């Protein structure tokens, strides 16, 4: 039952949050589904297709280049911090934000949607009016109860997943190269990949506050055909480290397969 999660939730020594959805059937499972939780790290996953919404209507272009200075160097950015005094496509600071997660790179992106109130009315104007996104990095990592900004639910953001990977907000070939480089992503190893069942091609996007607080969302294709499922789960002001929060999140892709 869905008490499985809560009682996962236990051990974690903090609050958990899971949407487990699979849109064709209509079956859904989780915990604290609409409850708020810390984006962190995956805001980048709406501000990337907010960029890709925009070059498809033309007000935008991935090939446009942007420039790198000193200043817009932040703590973990590995691949912005290479082209400081040049500049990068659209393209690339997409990438390196999703699949390293690079910090600077969403920083260089945001202004290119009107910041995190672009992003906001974005979500909006798709369907969903839970997401706020109220600051860039690292400031949005400030969480707070009765504080909404930069915060989602696990229902929204697993809704977010659909709209953007399998629904018709984004041309055929955006919503594509959004769904690869979730395919690609390089940091959710020991998160709910490690948990998953084998027959699913995950992609996913994930995040923590280095501190007490590790997110992962995914979309989950079967590999031999048919209709996929959406996974988000938010994991805030836990006991445990890093690496036992990474532990959790694994968890939860156990339960996830065996659900599927």
């Given at each position: 039952?869905?008490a499985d999660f809560?009682?996962?939730?236990k051990?974690?020594?903090?609050?958990?949050?899971?949407?487990?959805?699979h849109?064709?059937?209509?079956?859904?499972?989780?915990?604290?589904?609409?409850?708020?939780?810390?984006?962190?790290?995956?805001?980048?996953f709406?501000?990337?297709?907010?960029?890709?919404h925009?070059?498809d209507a033309g007000?935008?272009?991935l090939?446009?280049?942007?420039?790198?200075?000193?200043?817009?160097?932040?703590?973990?950015?590995p691949?912005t911090?290479?082209?400081?005094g040049?500049?990068?496509?659209v393209?690339?600071?997409?990438?390196?934000?999703?699949?390293?997660?690079?910090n600077?790179?969403?920083?260089?992106?945001?202004?290119?949607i009107d910041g995190?109130?672009?992003?906001?009315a974005?979500?909006?104007?798709?369907?969903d009016?839970?997401?706020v996104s109220?600051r860039?990095?690292p400031?949005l990592?400030?969480?707070?109860?009765?504080?909404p900004?930069?915060?989602?639910?696990p229902?929204?953001?697993?809704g977010?997943?659909?709209?953007?990977?399998l629904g018709?907000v984004?041309?055929?070939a955006?919503?594509?190269?959004?769904?690869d480089?979730?395919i690609?992503?390089q940091?959710?190893?020991?998160?709910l990949?490690?948990?998953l069942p084998q027959?699913?091609?995950?992609?996913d996007?994930?995040?923590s506050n280095?501190?007490?607080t590790?997110?992962?969302?995914?979309?989950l294709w079967p590999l031999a055909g048919?209709?996929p499922?959406?996974?988000?789960?938010?994991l805030?002001?836990?006991?445990?480290?890093?690496?036992?929060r990474?532990?959790?999140?694994?968890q939860?892709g156990?339960?996830?397969?065996?659900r599927?």
């Amino acid at each position: 039952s869905d008490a499985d999660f809560a009682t996962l939730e236990k051990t974690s020594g903090g609050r958990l949050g899971v949407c487990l959805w699979h849109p064709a059937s209509g079956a859904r499972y989780g915990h604290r589904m609409d409850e708020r939780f810390p984006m962190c790290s995956t805001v980048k996953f709406p501000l990337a297709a907010a960029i890709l919404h925009r070059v498809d209507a033309g007000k935008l272009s991935l090939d446009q280049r942007v420039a790198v200075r000193q200043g817009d160097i932040i703590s973990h950015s590995p691949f912005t911090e290479r082209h400081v005094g040049k500049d990068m496509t659209v393209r690339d600071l997409c990438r390196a934000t999703l699949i390293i997660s690079d910090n600077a790179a969403a920083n260089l992106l945001l202004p290119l949607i009107d910041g995190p109130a672009g992003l906001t009315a974005f979500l909006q104007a798709q369907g969903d009016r839970i997401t706020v996104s109220a600051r860039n990095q690292p400031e949005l990592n400030h969480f707070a109860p009765g504080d909404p900004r930069d915060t989602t639910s696990p229902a929204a953001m697993a809704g977010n997943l659909q709209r953007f990977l399998l629904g018709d907000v984004l041309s055929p070939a955006s919503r594509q190269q959004l769904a690869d480089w979730l395919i690609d992503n390089q940091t959710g190893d020991a998160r709910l990949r490690a948990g998953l069942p084998q027959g699913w091609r995950v992609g996913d996007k994930t995040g923590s506050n280095g501190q007490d607080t590790s997110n992962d969302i995914a979309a989950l294709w079967p590999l031999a055909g048919g209709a996929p499922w959406l996974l988000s789960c938010y994991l805030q002001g836990s006991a445990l480290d890093d690496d036992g929060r990474d532990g959790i999140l694994r968890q939860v892709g156990e339960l996830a397969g065996a659900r599927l």
